[PDB]
Write a protein that binds this ligand. Structure first.
Ligand SMILES: CC[C@H]1OC(=O)[C@H](C)[C@@H](OC(=O)NCCCOCCC#Cc2ccc3c(=O)c(C(=O)O)cn(C)c3c2)[C@H](C)[C@@H](O[C@@H]2O[C@H](C)C[C@H](N(C)C)[C@H]2O)[C@](C)(OC)C[C@@H](C)C(=O)[C@H](C)[C@H]2NC(=O)O[C@@]21C
Ligand SMILES: [Mg+2]
Lengths: 48, 112, 43, 120
RNA sequence: AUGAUGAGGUUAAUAGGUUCGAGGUGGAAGCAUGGUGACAUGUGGAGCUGACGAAUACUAAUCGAUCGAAGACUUAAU
RNA sequence: CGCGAGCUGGGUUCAGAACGUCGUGAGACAGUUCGGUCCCUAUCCGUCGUGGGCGUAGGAAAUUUGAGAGGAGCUGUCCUU
RNA sequence: CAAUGGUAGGAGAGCGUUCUAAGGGCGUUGAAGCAUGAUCGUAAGGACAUGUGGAGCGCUUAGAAGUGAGAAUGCCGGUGUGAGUAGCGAAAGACGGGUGAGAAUCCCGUCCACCGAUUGACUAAGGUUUCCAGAGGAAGGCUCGUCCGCUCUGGGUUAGUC
RNA sequence: CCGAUAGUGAACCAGUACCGUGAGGGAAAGGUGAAAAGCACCCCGGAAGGGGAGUGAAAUAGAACCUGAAACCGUGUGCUU
RNA sequence: UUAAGUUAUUAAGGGCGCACGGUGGAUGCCUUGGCACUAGAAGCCGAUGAAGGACGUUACUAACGACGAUAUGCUUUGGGGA
């Protein structure tokens, strides 16, 4: 139950290929033109 | 041509800051700001401020207006780590490395 | 669990302490070595 | 239905307390899961209020907490009285709804999707 | 497990609520009668009812964004 | 004498004790007897499921043949002739 | 013309590092180090050019040695991997208002919940300033933090009878 | 003879942090520049930081400050898969 | 056009070269401090209170030296020089 050997830099960088953050679901707000998250209330204006 | 802005010894481990910077690489200034302000991560407020400084730097020092700016390249690299310990079981102590980050952002007009 | 060193100022200063080391010649010794060593807390 | 990461007694209590507070304030801020679960409870209480017969009053007394509101001109009346005298009239003609929900961005301390549940 | 799969996004029954029902429980509350009381009887298979069936846009799936073809040579028939 | 980083720990093989025997004695016996701490967050190969990328000379929605592969594969009694 | 695999091992010739003696030299017109390069000798290794670098250092002959590291479960110091994984240390919180650059986490309020031969009140031993009021947020708080047993400033313990 | 893993344990408020009930044990830590000339003002930020301007021969000499190697971590890409 | 055959492209990521950064404190140069000695002094301090300490002492104030309630020092004789 211990690592029998090192994980080389190649293996490391390989495993984390799919480890990333997604760009937010952002759309432009119709009253102010600033971006907002879709289905959420704009925090700059306060609309829909 | 190129505006610079750097934040040093920020108290966030570099693996964690780089996850957010892998999004604003090569995007426009407005879109970049909208990403940061809406991405719900810890490093995001501290980067939105390094970007802000660069852009201000651009306007106040080069007359580089912000409507045409793109994060030419933006990265983060290790900083002066702070070493601490956690009292674990059976008298043994394990280490905790509180890391830091040297955030850099450069925005360009794409021109010469 | 009851561990060791249940502190007590009186016994600490009785078993140890300047006047106790000054009561026996061997007590006088440890002060001698501690001054040769340049120690700051002698007893 | 949902469990809200909590036991039965602690949830029963949280749901009824959150419903009472909503009735007091007419719009509150909370996380999605609990808004989605207080929606039904508050909607059903308002139904118990659209009839106003003593049976429904006594039965709605089960859920609401006993609180006092100081209205304008230092007028005082409790949650039951509000439900049956100021909210029954407002929704006498509407046959559902009674509540809306407006998603908001994630909070800082967690990644919880805060929302505002308001009486419509 | 997450992601996938599948049913739906207003030109909408996808989920919540409302209305009706199935199933479950078993005679709600308030009255009136009788009893000293503990209680009982009629109203009234009443009242309540999480996931189950149906109808209804009342509430939320409003706004928007991203990705995604223009089709290689060679030879044989055509 | 498959399998304890899957399990138990009764036997056996630590320290306690006791009986029979041997030894002057400390102790001893594969002679009995009662008691006696079973640790580990899985890196790789392997295996059971479950995603993403790319290739199948255009981009797609659906229906597919089957090269292979896997699973089953047991049997009783009674009656009739 | 003949010989030249080689371990324990014997023999010989040498390359390098510091210092010393003498001789002869190089150096802000840029020394030693450091980095790069497609250069030279049979090897240990030696130069040259270009960058960084901002003062010492080569060469010849000869002398002396703390003189050459890859392994000792070596010592010291840095940095990895396991991995964004395990863990986040017994428990009930919800919501309105306020404060701020920022709030599940700080202040106020309502409701709810837990203890109650005690998580309550005293007083010893022990610790010594953790006590109080302002202010701050690097660090310490297993998260956050505008908060604190944290930091800065200024304060606070009064006996003839205890 | 040694030049900061050396030379005293100690070049630096060292027999001191610290550890132990106590005898006792016992560290780690030098170098901005010639001169402090130690960065007036402006800009983003609550601040830490930074980016200009200025000081200086030099500021990848800006106080953790001479040179600044390797492990290690990144950002580009020429050729590959 | 259709049949048969052949071959790109791809890069989520990886490799190798190269460039530019960080981290870190090797190396080089440096000396405040050590080490081994030589030559000459000297080789007793205490009830006249020692050696070693503890408290104090400054305009303000913690630490280190110095000092002792005459305290961050006093007197005197000489040296010197803002
Ligand atoms: C809790 C964590 C710790 O783990 C452990 O204790 C586990 C439980 C232990 O498992 C075992 O007992 N065997 C499996 C059970 C075997 O039953 C048969 C009946 C018996 C017996 C016996 C015989 C003689 C003596 C003895 O003569 C004597 C004395 O006093 O002289 C003391 N007794 C007790 C004896 C008892 C580990 C794993 C043990 O290893 C094993 O031992 C053997 C020597 C060999 C095993 N293999 C090679 C075949 C080996 O695998 C060790 C020695 O532990 C004592 C592990 C060592 C490394 C440790 O020290 C670690 C740090 C532990 N210490 C601690 O704190 O964490 C531990 C991990
Ligand atoms: Mg312990």
């Amino acid at each position: 139950a211990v690592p029998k050997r090192r994980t080389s830099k190649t293996r490391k960088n390989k495993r984390r290929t799919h480890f990333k953050i997604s760009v937010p679901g952002m759309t432009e707000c119709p009253n102010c033109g600033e971006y907002k998250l879709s289905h959420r209330v704009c925090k700059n204006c306060g609309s829909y | 041509m190129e505006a610079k802005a750097v934040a040093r010894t920020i108290r966030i481990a570099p693996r964690k800051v780089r996850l957010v910077l892998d999004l604003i690489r090569g995007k426009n200034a407005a879109e970049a700001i909208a990403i940061l302000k809406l991405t719900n991560k810890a490093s995001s407020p501290v980067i939105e401020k390094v970007l802000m400084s660069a852009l201000a730097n651009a306007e106040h020092n080069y007359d580089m207006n912000t409507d045409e700016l793109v994060v030419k390249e933006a990265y983060a690299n290790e900083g002066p780590t702070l070493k601490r310990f956690r009292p674990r079981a059976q008298g043994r102590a394990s280490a905790i490395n509180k890391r830091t980050s040297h955030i850099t952002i450069v925005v360009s007009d794409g021109k010469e | 669990v009851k561990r060791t060193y249940q502190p007590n100022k009186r016994k600490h200063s009785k078993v140890h302490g300047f006047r106790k080391r000054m009561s026996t010649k061997n007590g006088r010794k440890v002060l001698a070595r501690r001054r040769r060593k340049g120690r700051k807390v002698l007893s | 239905y949902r469990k809200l990461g909590r036991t039965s007694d602690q949830r029963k209590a949280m749901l009824r307390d959150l419903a009472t507070s909503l009735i007091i304030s007419e719009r509150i801020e909370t996380t999605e899961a609990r808004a989605k679960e207080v929606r039904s409870v508050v909607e059903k209480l308002i139904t118990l209020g659209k009839k106003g017969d003593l049976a429904s009053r006594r039965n709605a007394a089960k859920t609401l907490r006993n609180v006092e509101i100081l209205n304008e001109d230092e007028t005082t009346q409790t949650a039951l009285q509000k439900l049956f005298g100021e909210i029954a009239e407002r929704y006498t003609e509407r046959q559902g709804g009674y509540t809306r929900i407006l998603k908001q961005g994630p909070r800082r301390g967690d990644g919880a999707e805060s929302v505002i549940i308001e009486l419509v």
